RNA sequence: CGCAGAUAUCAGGAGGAACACCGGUGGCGAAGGCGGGUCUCUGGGCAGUAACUGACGCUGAGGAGCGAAAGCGUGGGGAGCGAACAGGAUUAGAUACCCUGGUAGUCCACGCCGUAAACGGUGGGUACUAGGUGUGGGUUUCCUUCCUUGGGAUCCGUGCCGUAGCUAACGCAUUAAGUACCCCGCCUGGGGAGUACGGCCGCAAGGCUAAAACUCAAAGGAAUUGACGGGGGCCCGCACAAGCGGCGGAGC
RNA sequence: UAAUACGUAGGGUCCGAGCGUUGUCCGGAAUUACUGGGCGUAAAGAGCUCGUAGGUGGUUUGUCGCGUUGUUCGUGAAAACUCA
RNA sequence: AGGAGGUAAAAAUGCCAA
């Protein structure tokens, strides 16, 4: 098991400008990753994708790369 | 809801006796400390003490064990339950056991043994049955 | 279906429906049920303080509301899928499974209907009864770096394993099917039958309430021992496979 | 076609001026379960809530004596039932 | 110890005692 990296103090606020922080958590393919394999918290994987999504949704992130 | 204190202590009491616990701690109040006192006296229960707490006075019951593991306490019934209430005459008493147990009744003259209620004179409502 | 230029590949356009990855034995909701994004309106829950009211609680006959899908009415829309319907194929026969098409329907608006293995096959409220380990929401003491699923305590939710106890058995086991109290619904052998008649509701399909004659000596639940399987696993045998020689044809 | 279950015999058992059959009720039937049953899979939890009547009710002080309990009087005809 | 891929044309019936 692998720490929350959000949930610490130092994490960072969570949004959708901020183009290599939600990059670290888009796989290659332009997919999602799993909680799993990523190690945040329920809240924070929630946050993350749907910040990643209205990235998507403003083209600064691409639809299956 | 909490419809009828008594029968709680009673659950409360066998409950305990069953799990081998030794002190057993209520809400307290004087229809349950009289019960307690006819208990104590006919043996089945060790001791019992009344401890203030947050919101009002609390029941403590020590129970009785037998050297050899034995459980003071067989059975423990309630009988006059709301709804379906039970009033004895005095001719018509109720035996435990053929009369090895008691049964506590209340009377004008207060919570009385089967016995003391056969003794004098009185009858009143069947409570309930320990044995 | 194509050779009248298909399938394939590139570019542009039209329209409808469902929302990959996040996404799970995880969340919310009373139950049906609810996940593309944003904004607006709106319901419930949980924790801490305990400032307020001071038993105002629980259940609830009838009743009222909500209630998957299919189905119905009126008006839209209709990409994919697709009852019915057509061919093809299989077969003894295929009104089926498989294939190629394909209407209602599935979608929207406003209304009907009111049923499901609508299931946890487990009505609601309350108190008590060994624990262990996950996970979701929130408070707090101690290691304290005070970084940290550090560890503990407490409340609420949701799984697994497990004593006592209960059960016919399977199993349930602090989320009880355990020990108890209150209120409600229901059962009284299997068919006939959730059917007939009567009544209420519905546009209709139908739903709800609900028998009797006759007939059977059983219908059932759980578990055990075999047998069987066009169930699985591991093995053998001239069983197949690789070969040699026949029988089935002729006369006796 | 080798019946202690049919018919007849012997023998036996139970009753006895009776012995059997039918009809009807109660029991056994805890099988309508007040005493004294149940609803996961055997029959049986309404699909789910809200709420009317009703039922039910936390801790404590005082009063009433309706329920409850004790005693006494009247009544509960006789016959019936039970004891002598 | 963890784990991936592939794998069936058609095949009906059999009387009621011991
Ligand atoms: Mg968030
Ligand atoms: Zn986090």
Request: hydrophobic content about 35%; overall charge positive; aromatic content about 6%.
């Amino acid at each position: 098991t692998r720490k929350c990296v959000f949930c610490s103090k130092k994490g960072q606020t969570i949004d959708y400008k901020d183009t290599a922080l939600l990059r670290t958590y888009i796989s290659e393919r332009g997919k999602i990753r799993a909680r799993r394999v990523t190690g945040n918290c329920v809240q924070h994987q929630r946050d993350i994708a749907v910040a990643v999504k209205n990235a998507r949704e403003v083209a600064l992130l691409p639809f299956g790369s | 809801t909490m419809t009828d204190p008594i029968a709680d202590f009673l659950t409360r009491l066998r409950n305990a006796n069953s799990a081998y616990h030794d002190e057993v701690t209520l809400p307290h109040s004087k229809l349950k400390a009289n019960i307690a006192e006819i208990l104590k006296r006919e043996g089945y229960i060790s001791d019992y003490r009344t401890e203030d707490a947050r919101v009002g006075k609390s029941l403590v019951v020590q129970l009785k064990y037998g050297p050899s593991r034995e459980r003071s306490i067989a059975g423990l019934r309630r009988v006059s339950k709301p709804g379906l209430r039970v009033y004895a005459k005095s001719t018509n008493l109720p035996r435990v056991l053929g009369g090895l147990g008691v049964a506590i009744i209340s009377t004008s003259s207060g919570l009385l043994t089967d016995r003391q209620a056969a003794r004098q004179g009185v009858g009143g409502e069947v409570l309930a049955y320990v044995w």
